């Protein structure tokens, strides 16, 4: 057993890079996103902090997302969820409050 409360970010995924900085992911959005549906979720290892980042056409956004030190990842204006899997999938449905629903992952795919 190690030291960790709940989930510890899931690498396996495009729009889920628990390494990117924040800009790095927003520059990626620079790449893609047109229909105002691209997004990406990121995590951090400092004090449990996640934030969704989607672009509203040439206007990349970010949304803070955390829990109540309970494990339930939520959002003030956004919503509430168990994990970034639900908050993402859910939001994968709608915006729920975002600028616009989600439709595409930000992160990259290949090289060239």
């Amino acid at each position: 057993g190690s030291r960790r409360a709940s989930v510890g970010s899931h690498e396996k995924m495009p729009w889920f890079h628990g390494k990117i900085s924040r800009e790095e992911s927003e520059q990626i959005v620079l790449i893609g996103s047109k229909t105002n549906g691209k997004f990406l979720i990121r995590a951090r290892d400092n004090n449990g902090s996640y934030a969704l980042c989607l672009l509203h056409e040439g206007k990349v956004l970010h949304y803070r997302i955390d829990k109540d030190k309970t494990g339930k990842l939520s959002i003030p204006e956004g919503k509430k969820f168990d994990t970034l899997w639900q908050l993402v999938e859910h939001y994968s449905y709608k915006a729920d409050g975002l600028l616009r629903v989600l439709t595409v992952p930000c992160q990259k795919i290949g090289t060239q």
Binding site: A51, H62, Y63, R64, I75, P76, L98
Partner: peptide, 5 residues
């Protein structure tokens, strides 16, 4: 840096 959800 967080829009308003």
């Amino acid at each position: 840096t967080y829009e308003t959800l």
